[PDB]
Amino acid sequence: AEPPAQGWDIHCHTVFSDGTETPRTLVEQARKLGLHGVAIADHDTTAGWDEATEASEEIGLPLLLGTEITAVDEDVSVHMLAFQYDPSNEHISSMFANTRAARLRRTKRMVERLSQDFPITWDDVLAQVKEGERTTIGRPHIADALVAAGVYETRSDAFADAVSAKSKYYIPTPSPSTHEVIAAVKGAGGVVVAAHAGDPQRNRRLLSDEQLDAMIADGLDGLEVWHRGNPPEQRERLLTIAARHDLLVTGGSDWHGKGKPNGLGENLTDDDTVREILCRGVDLIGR
Ligand SMILES: Nc1ncnc2c1ncn2[C@@H]1O[C@H](COP(=O)(O)O)[C@@H](O)[C@H]1O
Ligand SMILES: [Fe+3]
Numbered sequence: 236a237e238p239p240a241q242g243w244d245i246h247c248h249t250v251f252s253d254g255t256e257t258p259r260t261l262v263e264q265a266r267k268l269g270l271h272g273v274a275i276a277d278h279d280t281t282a283g284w285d286e287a288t289e290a291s292e293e294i295g296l297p298l299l300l301g302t303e304i305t306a307v308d309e310d311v312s313v314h315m316l317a318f319q320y321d322p323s324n325e326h327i328s329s330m331f332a333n334t335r336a337a338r339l340r341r342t343k344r345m346v347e348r349l350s351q352d353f354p355i356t357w358d359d360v361l362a363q364v365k366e367g368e369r370t371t372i373g374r375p376h377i378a379d380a381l382v383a384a385g386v387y388e389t390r391s392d393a394f395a396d397a398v399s400a401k402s403k404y405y406i407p408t409p410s411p412s413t414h415e416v417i418a419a420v421k422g423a424g425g426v427v428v429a430a431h432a433g434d435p436q437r438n439r440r441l442l443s444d445e446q447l448d449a450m451i452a453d454g455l456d457g458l459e460v461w462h463r464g465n466p467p468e469q470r471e472r473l474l475t476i477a478a479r480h481d482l483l484v485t486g487g488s489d490w491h492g493k494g495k496p497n498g499l500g501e502n503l504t505d506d507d508t509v510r511e512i513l514c515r516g517v518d519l520i521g522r
């Protein structure tokens with residue numbers, strides 16, 4: 236297989252987490268770029284769903300409703316994309332609330348340490364959280380505060396240094412397991428995809444085939460293959476696993492607006508695969 240030349244970008248972040256733009260801007264731009272549709276996929280939240288739906292309806296661009304869920308498997312950080320699930324589901328709702336509170340707590344303790352050595356305060360970080368309580372907070376907002384304070388040129392510079400996972404300031408966020416996340420997403424009627432699973436900058440080691448097999452047995456629907464973080468060998472490895480188990484194969488930009496170099500639409504999911512996501516997920520039309 237090859238990355239599709241046309242289709243949907245199903246991996247896009249907004250101000251409701253670590254992106255710089257609104258759901259409306261995402262939809263408007265996705266249409267302008269000739270995309271067939273888009274998804275919102277903010278971290279550990281559905282807070283931008285109503286805004287995204289409204290935009291989609293006003294601008295006339297099909298939308299997938301999604302969330303990027305922070306998770307862990309043994310010692311491996313794993314991000315799970317969850318699409319078209321019941322947002323009022325009590326298990327998934329409380330798991331997100333817990334992750335957001337754990338994130339808040341962690342990110343505050345990181346800023347407390349960073350402020351000993353850098354000119355940043357909790358309020359400078361809060362200034363970078365664009366939707367307030369409705370924004371899922373994390374390291375990008377710290378990086379942004381350090382750029383607003385003049386310590387680094389870009390958000391990516393900050394991550395190369397003080398905000399890096401290697402640094403003495405770093406704290407990990409307590410996260411649910413991939414087995415729990417998959418059960419919750421399937422419980423809520425959704426479709427679950429392992430995000431950029433071949434990406435080494437994320438982890439000391441990638442998920443192994445055995446860990447992927449156990450997630451497939453849990454109900455994993457798919458693998459994000461077309462992503463700038465997956466090198467060629469890993470794309471072939473993941474495509475093979477997907478072919479062997481009949482998994483869906485997705486692509487997306489991981490756009491965060493000005494927060495990353497990733498271009499909206501730079502990788503895509505084909506129309507057939509989006510069809511299938513929609514058919515497997517919950518009918519949210521009306522809700
Ligand atoms: N410019 C950037 N460089 C590195 N990571 C970024 C950037 N913008 C957003 N992120 C995200 O920051 C997240 C880590 O934050 P956290 O989950 O709070 O540890 C990773 O999922 C990221 O890819
Ligand atoms: Fe991710």
Ligand SMILES: [Fe+3]
Pocket residue numbers: 246248303489
């Ligand atoms: Fe992402």
Ligand SMILES: [Zn+2]
Pocket residue numbers: 248252253254278491
């Ligand atoms: Zn992000």
